[PDB]
Design a protein around this motif. Structure first.
Motif, mmCIF file in Angstrom:
data_model
loop_
_atom_site.group_PDB
_atom_site.id
_atom_site.type_symbol
_atom_site.label_atom_id
_atom_site.label_comp_id
_atom_site.label_asym_id
_atom_site.label_seq_id
_atom_site.Cartn_x
_atom_site.Cartn_y
_atom_site.Cartn_z
ATOM 1 N N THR B 232 0.811 -1.221 0.000
ATOM 2 C CA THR B 232 0.000 0.000 0.000
ATOM 3 C C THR B 232 0.849 1.279 0.000
ATOM 4 O OG1 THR B 232 -1.829 -1.114 1.146
ATOM 5 C CG2 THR B 232 -1.796 1.283 1.251
ATOM 6 N N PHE B 270 -5.726 -2.195 -2.563
ATOM 7 C CA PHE B 270 -4.618 -2.799 -3.307
ATOM 8 C C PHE B 270 -5.040 -4.101 -4.003
ATOM 9 C CE2 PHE B 270 -0.568 -4.965 -3.924
ATOM 10 C CZ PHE B 270 0.250 -3.924 -4.354
ATOM 11 N N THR B 366 -3.357 0.376 -7.149
ATOM 12 C CA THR B 366 -3.496 0.944 -5.808
ATOM 13 C C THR B 366 -4.610 1.975 -5.799
ATOM 14 O OG1 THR B 366 -1.091 0.714 -5.537
ATOM 15 C CG2 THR B 366 -2.306 1.949 -3.820
#
Ligand SMILES: CC[C@H](C)[C@H](NC(=O)[C@H]1CCCCN1C)C(=O)N(CCCCC(C)C)[C@H](C[C@@H](O)c1nc(C(=O)N[C@@H](Cc2ccc(F)cc2)C[C@H](C)C(=O)O)cs1)C(C)C
Ligand SMILES: Nc1nc2c(ncn2[C@@H]2O[C@H](COP(=O)(O)OP(=O)(O)OP(=O)(O)O)[C@@H](O)[C@H]2O)c(=O)[nH]1
Ligand SMILES: Nc1ncnc2c1ncn2[C@@H]1O[C@H](COP(=O)(O)OP(=O)(O)CP(=O)(O)O)[C@@H](O)[C@H]1O
Ligand SMILES: Nc1nc2c(ncn2[C@@H]2O[C@H](COP(=O)(O)OP(=O)(O)O)[C@@H](O)[C@H]2O)c(=O)[nH]1
Ligand SMILES: [Ca+2]
Ligand SMILES: [Mg+2]
Ligand SMILES: [Mg+2]
Lengths: 338, 428, 53, 437
Positions: B232, B270, B366
């Protein structure tokens, strides 16, 4: 899953369209201000056409043709007919009409009017009805808004029993490709109290709406005669058919009107698409000549026919553009070579 | 050079911070000694965002390691990438903070904080154009939560016109059994609402559930949790570390993500979710990345996105893929699910693509969302907080460091206000 | 219908064709506006440092 | 000969600037050295190309240009790229930290601290001009520098050069390549502040260009390189009259005279054809009738809108290539009978026409094919107000919630500048409707 937005709550026709679309299970309704729609069932007035076709990854379709107001306002229709070579000025099927502003073609109106005086012919006009010019000019100047002096048909076709007036409503759907589709079912909106030549004050035998008719419903249900019955009246009483005596002229008038504005309103090479349901209002004189009275840009259907027409609008107008997982329309096309 | 100054505080802060530096050093071809050994000039174009450059062509993280005990930072120094950090940037006491926000913020942390700021000052003065600061910490402990928020407040005083960014780890009873964590978290959130521009809500509840349910790890470790945190962290800083169009700096990110000043708490996501070692041999398609990055099961904050509306979204795709296909798939998500994106911020999803994927993957995505659903996380803390606070339970550990109950009432209030503020915009 | 104003040259030519006929703030004011913004900006920053004090 | 100074503000302005001078250099036979073999008067002159290019004693031809951005990155690429030796270092002005997609930061905060330096550098070009006619300003509506700094500059330029014309080429924001959600705010702010100070403004909607690049150049996902090389062609068609021998639009005052009867309604619609993929293997060359008819297709316009539902107040056709007046007039006659072209009652229905015999130059290894004839139609139509409606709608949606407003107020700006800017645009939309029906 396709998406749509409803922006006219008063539309009886598009209330039924949204209902029918939701029932399919492949159309979700969004709230009016959500821009990420495939289909707009738009508002009557000030519809924001400038905002359509600028959402990437969405093909957008609207239920009005921008510029179609030119056909659907009385003073715009006269001017359209009078100034387009394809119709004007010797158009045989539109009553002699003049656009008149209150306190313009009033000088041109009085000129043709005063030859009907010395010619000694029936000089009645509509705005409402009178045979003297003074009453009409002084009526509008008082009234308020812009109006039309149009030639009144002294000799309408009259239904029997009862010696009554009527008018024909034909519903017409123009799709995104500019295919003109006349719905096979039309309707006659009848007067139920005998037409009177001398008596112009009482305006119930003369004006054949569904509302102003309020005896009422003596001859047919809700003062609505339909095409099977009217075809039969024409066969029995006049030895002719609806198709031959009236419906060809209606087809010609509809197709002429809509081809005249196609260059101005078509969405063929545009970034959003349009369709629209029109209601054409026709008058039939005693010689079985059809006359166009007006065109309504936001018609209502008749109670009996709602279910069929609205399913038609979904099938040919909406599902043509947005496909899902026996034809009620006659397609109006003519290409004569000369 | 638009330099970011990194600070990591407390056990959690130093642990996820250490791992961040490992991951991005590998992505930029920096090795444990600070030497470049990469095969692409894209790695070095914006290296000065996170690394100072010394003589001998050496790259040193612009990183300050803070703690009130020595254990975690000896672990970092002794670790594989530990020799990379500047030695004078390790600033630590001996006392510890005893999982007590008051000790970190007011007593034990007060004694050490001016030596942290001296290192921050030194790193800042050396910057041609400083963007601001990013802090890694937990909100449930003492040092990271209490001292970390003290640091934020002091840095804001010295540098009022720079961006303050945090990666704040939220406590969950699935990971910790310290009874006073809701106290420390509520006090710390009060600070974050006033003094940060952007906060990434990394929720331990979500990290645990991802590891247990999705990754099938029946006994997750902190390492398993942190592997998702570092992915992340690599993901959300991509736009800051490579060229170069969308959200390329901290202020531009903030102007895109923060429609109201207090609502600056983000919900990161994610795809693909992976565990360490256990190999992704199959690369994801652009349609799967897009489905998965917006999935509830892929969020690092334990909030149901369908329970709120997105105010703003940043999506960042990594690897070599079709930009056309990314654009189609992104438009598809917002058109098929349009009612979860507020109509009153047009075009509120922005998309970036970076050509270099992360280690061990060909394709990643992301997600960074400012959703009103984040109220569920704060509401969970508030309920845990009110349960104790209505009986003044465990409050003597805090009043014995000189705090009054009124501080608790104010922090309780400000967080409940934050919650109602999110509900305000969810119903507009 | 009607061509007019025809000019020719070696590079090209131009003309007009008719189908149908018819039928500032001062330098001071800018600075008062820029300085007032700076003063509002500095007031906001001073209030912040007041609160942090 | 009367000189024109080009000013390029922000990333969009600068990058559209590069593509433009690249294209001019090719058109005029100038090399990246600055050397023009065909120019025989060495060390000076007063040819038509000297409107855009000054001259040094060594035979170097230097753009009358200033590039300004609040951030070194993109102007640093100009400093180090193909055309580095063309520009004097004092023409390329850079700040340190940019305006963060914030009008207020570009206008008030960082604008205040850089404005006087930019004017000093513009003053150095005006001093080496015998008869300056004014300025061509390139910028985005959406960026902070493009919106905020440009509007400040325009106010200054009015003060320091009141009698000089100012033309804009403005990039109108599109979600397909936008980098900020606050571009509608930025756009209305700069439009409000710049409205009085601009004599004629050419809006290019990135949406229209992006689609033209997909549809006609067969490009999957257009970049700024794709978009700018098309934009630069449209810009070149427009500025060709100032840089080449001719009698239509020979000076900046004529653009206003020919295209802008109403001073506030100064946004002419640009339409360009033909746009033909270089990779296209076999192509039937389009006639004068065909390219002229393509000027009335929404798909070819710089801003998607519908001129059928508006009124024209002026209309220039600017041809490049093998075109004679006989073909242009025949084409207009045909077109007029098939299409809806209403002018306002107080202007003649008619077309100012300009032809240059040199066909359009293309950048070698570009996306655009060489063609025998091209045209840019410049028509002032009320239909372009559709672009203001769209933008004003997005503004209203956000502003009713005061979303992002705190970013602007934080930089010194007052919440009231928003509603002023907005109600100025309300009146502008209302002006266009008054003229149009
Ligand atoms: C027997 C207690 C176990 C260890 C504990 N269970 C609980 O707390 C349960 C019991 C009752 C009710 C619910 N709670 C949550 C537990 O499994 N923990 C957290 C509590 C540790 C606190 C105290 C006991 C030290 C897990 C983490 C724990 O297993 C540890 N992981 C590590 C760990 O990650 N060590 C790495 C290094 C490291 C050390 C310290 C760190 F902070 C981070 C990383 C190296 C290893 C090889 C790796 O990378 O996997 C050290 S301890 C959580 C994810 C739930
Ligand atoms: N056509 C085109 N549009 C661009 C280009 N660069 C940016 N844009 C557009 O311009 C807007 C962004 O403005 P920029 O010019 O990048 O911003 P700026 O003026 O540099 O301002 P700051 O970066 O905020 O200081 C968006 O609508 C972009 O899509 C370009 O090279 N060509
Ligand atoms: N020239 C004419 N000759 C004969 N009758 C006429 C006429 N003009 C109007 N009428 C009568 O008036 C009635 C309604 O006319 P019109 O359609 O113009 O008014 P309107 O538009 O308010 C009703 P709607 O819009 O609902 O169809 C018709 O049914 C017709 O009988
Ligand atoms: N995800 C994660 N959480 C951690 C880690 N270490 C501690 N925590 C959590 O952080 C909280 C305690 O904070 P900690 O950082 O240990 O205290 P500090 O040393 O005083 O800052 C608890 O909720 C722990 O579950 C870690 O390495 N990873
Ligand atoms: Ca010369
Ligand atoms: Mg600890
Ligand atoms: Mg910029």
């Amino acid at each position: 899953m396709y998406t749509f937005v409803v922006r006219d709550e008063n539309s009886s026709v598009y209330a039924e369209v949204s209902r029918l679309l939701l029932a399919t299970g492949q159309w979700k309704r969004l709230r009016k201000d959500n821009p990420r729609f495939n289909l707009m069932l738009g508002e009557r007035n000030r519809l924001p056409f400038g905002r359509l076709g600028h959402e990437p990854g969405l093909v957008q379709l609207v239920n009005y043709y921008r510029g179609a107001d030119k056909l659907c306002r009385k003073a715009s229709l006269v001017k359209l007919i009078k100034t387009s070579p394809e119709l004007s000025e010797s158009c045989t099927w539109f009553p002699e009409s003049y656009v008149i502003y209150p306190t313009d073609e009033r000088e041109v109106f009085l000129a043709a009017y005063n030859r009907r005086r010395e010619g000694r012919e029936g000089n009645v006009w509509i705005a409402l009805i009178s045979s003297e010019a003074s009453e009409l000019l002084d009526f509008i100047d008082e009234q308020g808004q812009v109006h039309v002096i149009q030639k009144y048909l002294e000799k309408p076709l009259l239904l029997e029993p009862g010696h009554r007036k009527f008018d024909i409503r034909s519903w017409v759907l123009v799709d995104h490709l500019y295919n003109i589709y006349l719905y096979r079912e039309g309707v006659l909106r009848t007067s139920s109290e005998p037409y009177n030549s001398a008596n112009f004050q009482d305006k119930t035998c003369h004006l054949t709406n569904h509302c102003i008719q309020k005896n009422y419903g003596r001859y047919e249900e809700g003062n609505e005669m339909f095409f099977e019955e009217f075809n039969q009246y024409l066969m029995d009483a006049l030895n002719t058919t609806l198709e031959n005596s009236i419906l060809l002229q209606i087809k010609h008038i509809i197709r002429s009107c809509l081809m005249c504005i196609e260059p101005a309103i078509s969405t063929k090479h545009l970034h959003y698409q349009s369709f629209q349901l029109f209601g054409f209002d026709f008058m039939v004189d005693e010689e079985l000549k059809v006359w166009l009275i007006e065109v309504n840009g936001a018609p209502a259907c008749a109670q009996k026919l709602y279910a069929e027409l609205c399913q038609g609008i979904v099938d040919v107008a909406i599902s043509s553009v947005f496909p899902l997982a026996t034809s009620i329309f006659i397609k109006l096309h003519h290409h004569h070579h000369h | 050079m638009r330099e970011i100054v990194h600070i990591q505080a407390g056990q959690c802060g130093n642990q996820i911070g250490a791992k961040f530096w490992e991951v991005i050093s590998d992505e930029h071809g920096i090795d444990p000694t600070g030497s470049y050994h990469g095969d692409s000039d894209l790695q070095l174009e914006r290296i000065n965002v996170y690394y100072n450059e010394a003589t001998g062509n050496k790259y040193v993280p612009r990183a300050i390691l803070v703690d009130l005990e020595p254990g975690t930072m000896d672990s970092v120094r002794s670790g594989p990438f530990g020799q990379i950090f500047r030695p004078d940037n390790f600033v630590f006491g001996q006392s510890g903070a005893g999982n007590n926000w008051a000790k970190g913020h007011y007593t034990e942390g007060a004694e050490l904080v001016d030596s942290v700021l001296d290192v921050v000052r030194k790193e800042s003065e050396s910057c041609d154009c400083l963007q601001g600061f990013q802090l890694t910490h937990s909100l449930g402990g003492g040092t990271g939560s209490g001292m970390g928020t003290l640091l934020i407040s002091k840095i804001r005083e010295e540098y009022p016109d720079r961006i303050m960014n945090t990666f704040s780890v939220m406590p969950s009873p699935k990971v910790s059994d310290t009874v006073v964590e809701p106290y420390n978290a509520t006090l710390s959130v009060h600070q974050l609402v006033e003094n940060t521009d952007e906060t990434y809500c990394i929720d331990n509840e979500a990290l645990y559930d991802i590891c247990f349910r999705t990754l099938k790890l029946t006994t997750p470790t902190y390492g398993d949790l942190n592997h998702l945190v570092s992915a992340t962290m690599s993901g959300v800083t991509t736009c800051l570390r490579f060229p170069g169009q969308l959200n390329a700096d901290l202020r531009k990110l903030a102007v895109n993500m923060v429609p109201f000043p207090r609502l600056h708490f983000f919900m990161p996501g994610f795809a693909p979710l992976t565990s360490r070692g256990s190999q992704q041999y199959r690369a994801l398609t652009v349609p799967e990345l897009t489905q998965q990055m917006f999935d509830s099961k892929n969020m690092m904050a334990a909030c149901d996105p369908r329970h709120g509306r997105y105010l703003t979204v940043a999506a960042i795709f990594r690897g070599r893929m079709s930009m056309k296909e990314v654009d189609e798939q992104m438009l598809n998500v917002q058109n098929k699910n349009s009612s979860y994106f507020v109509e009153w911020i047009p075009n509120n999803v922005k998309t970036a693509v970076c050509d270099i994927p992360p280690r061990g993957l060909k394709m990643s995505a992301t997600f960074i969302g400012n959703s009103t659903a984040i109220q569920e996380l704060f509401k969970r803390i508030s309920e845990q907080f009110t349960a104790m606070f209505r009986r003044k339970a465990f409050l003597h550990w805090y009043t014995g460091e000189g705090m009054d109950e009124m501080e608790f009432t104010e922090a309780e209030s400000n967080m409940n206000d934050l919650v109602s503020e999110y509900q305000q915009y969810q119903d507009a | 219908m009607e061509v007019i104003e025809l000019n020719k040259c070696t590079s090209g030519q131009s003309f007009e064709v008719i189908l149908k006929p018819p039928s500032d703030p001062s330098l001071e004011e800018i600075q008062k506006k820029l300085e007032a913004a700076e003063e509002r900006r500095k007031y906001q920053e001073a209030e912040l440092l007041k609160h942090l004090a | 000969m009367r000189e024109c100074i080009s000013i390029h503000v922000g990333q969009a302005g600068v990058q559209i600037g590069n593509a433009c001078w690249e294209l001019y250099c090719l058109e005029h036979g100038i090399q990246p050295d600055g050397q023009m073999p065909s120019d025989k008067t060495i060390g000076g002159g007063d040819d038509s190309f000297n409107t855009f290019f000054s001259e040094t004693g060594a035979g170097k031809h230097v753009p009358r240009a200033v590039f300004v951005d609040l951030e070194p990155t993109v102007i640093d690429e100009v400093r180090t790229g193909t055309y580095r030796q063309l520009f004097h270092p004092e023409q390329l002005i850079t700040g340190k930290e940019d305006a963060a997609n914030n009008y207020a930061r570009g206008h008030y905060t960082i604008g205040k601290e850089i404005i006087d330096l930019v004017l000093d550098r513009i003053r150095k070009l005006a001093d080496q001009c015998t008869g300056l006619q004014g300025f061509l300003v390139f910028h985005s509506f959406g960026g902070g520098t493009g919106s905020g700094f440009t509007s400040l500059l325009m106010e200054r330029l009015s003060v320091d050069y009141g009698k000089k014309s100012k033309l804009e080429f403005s990039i109108y924001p599109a979600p397909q390549v936008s980098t900020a959600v606050v571009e509608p705010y930025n756009s209305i702010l700069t439009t409000h502040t710049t409205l009085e100070h601009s004599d004629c403004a050419f809006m290019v909607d990135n949406e229209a260009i992006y689609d033209i690049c997909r549809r006609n150049l067969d490009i999957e996902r257009p970049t700024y390189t794709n978009l700018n090389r098309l934009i630069s062609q449209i810009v070149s068609s427009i500025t060709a009259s100032l840089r080449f021998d001719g009698a239509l639009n020979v000076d900046l005052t004529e653009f206003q005279t020919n295209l802008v009867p109403y001073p506030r309604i100064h946004f002419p619609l640009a339409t360009y054809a033909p746009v033909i993929s270089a990779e296209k293997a076999y192509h039937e060359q389009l006639s004068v009738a065909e390219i002229t008819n393509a000027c009335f297709e929404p798909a070819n316009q710089m801003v998607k809108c519908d001129p059928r539902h508006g009124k024209y107040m002026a209309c220039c056709l600017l041809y490049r290539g093998d075109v004679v007046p006989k073909d242009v007039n025949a084409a207009i006659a045909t077109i007029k009978t098939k299409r809806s072209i209403q002018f306002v009652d107080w202007c003649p229905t008619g077309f100012k026409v300009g032809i240059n015999y040199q066909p359009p130059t293309v950048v070698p290894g570009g996306d655009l094919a060489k063609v025998q004839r091209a045209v840019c139609m410049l028509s002032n139509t009320t239909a372009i107000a559709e672009a203001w409606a769209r933008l004003d709608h997005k503004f209203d949606l956000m502003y009713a919630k005061r979303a992002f407003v705190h970013w602007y107020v934080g930089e010194g700006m007052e919440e009231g500048e928003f509603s002023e800017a907005r109600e100025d645009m309300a009146a502008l939309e209302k002006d266009y409707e008054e003229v149009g029906v």
